[PDB]
Amino acid sequence: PQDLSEALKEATKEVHTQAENAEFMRNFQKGQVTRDGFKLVMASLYHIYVALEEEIERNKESPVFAPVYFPEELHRKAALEQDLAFWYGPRWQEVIPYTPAMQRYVKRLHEVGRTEPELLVAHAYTRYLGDLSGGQVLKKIAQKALDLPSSGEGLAFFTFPNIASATKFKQLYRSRMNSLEMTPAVRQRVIEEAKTAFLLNIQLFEELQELLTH
Ligand code: HEM
Ligand SMILES: O=C(CCc1ccccc1)Cn1cncn1
């Protein structure tokens, strides 16, 4: 559809279904996640968000990203550092895994941010709006399954404290995505990058599932 927000949703409809069907996702939705499995995901998300939010800061002024620049409402790096310190302890940054599928995702993020900053919106869309939509649902599953201590730590990633209403912000973010000035050629590449982003997520959760058994 003419609006980029609708165009991205239509284009990634099929790959989103693939993600829903993914083995780890099937297991998680039924509360079959272990602490090691959950730690593995938190570690992955950290690496992904470090790369993404590094590239966002590099391209925050540029007309190709500036309209969708919402650091205070969306940034997840700081929250993930807080959570990993709980999950992996004081030595978290030394001991956290960095696997091929994490590397490939991080690699693509840096490639986009450095050489194709016009497509960064596709990765920011895929990460932020996805994580915002499922944040509280995924948290509630994690709370039930993982049986945490009363330490008040470990799940900061799943709350966006500067977004009171997810629907309110998502409507604003979509409008800002639609406000982006781009040529027909760039627009098509943005669409393709969104599918690539979804596929990098699918490839990641497939790898994580493979690593968990055993
Ligand atoms: C168990 C797997 C998953 C389920 C059940 C699921 C389900 C959902 C649901 C119910 C929504 C809210 C619908 C809406 O109002 O837009 C949503 C949003 C979204 N999800 Fe997922 N999802 C899954 C995995 C993923 C993955 C791996 C990604 C890739 C990063 C992803 C990306 C997104 C995006 C970008 C949105 C926002 C769509 C929009 O509003 O334009 N999802 N998802
Ligand atoms: O799936 C999402 C983040 C990946 C993840 C999966 C399981 C546990 C923690 C984190 C966000 N999302 C996208 N659509 C709905 N939710």
UniProtKB/Swiss-Prot annotation:
This is Heme oxygenase 1. Expressed at higher levels in renal cancer tissue than in normal tissue (at protein level). GO terms for biological process: angiogenesis; cellular response to arsenic-containing substance; cellular response to cadmium ion; cellular response to cisplatin; cellular response to heat; endothelial cell proliferation; epithelial cell apoptotic process; erythrocyte homeostasis. Heme b binds at residues 9, 16, 125, 174. The keyword Protein biosynthesis does not apply. It is an enzyme of class 1 (oxidoreductase). The chain holds residues 10 to 223 of 288 of the full protein. GO terms for molecular function: enzyme binding; heme binding; heme oxygenase (decyclizing) activity; identical protein binding; metal ion binding; protein homodimerization activity; structural molecule activity. One of its GO terms (cellular component) is extracellular space. (Microbial infection) Interacts with SARS-CoV-2 ORF3A protein; the interaction promotes ORF3A-induced autophagy but is unlikely to be involved in ORF3A-mediated induction of reticulophagy. It is a single-pass type IV membrane protein. A soluble form arises by proteolytic removal of the membrane anchor. Coiled coil: none annotated. It comes from Homo sapiens.
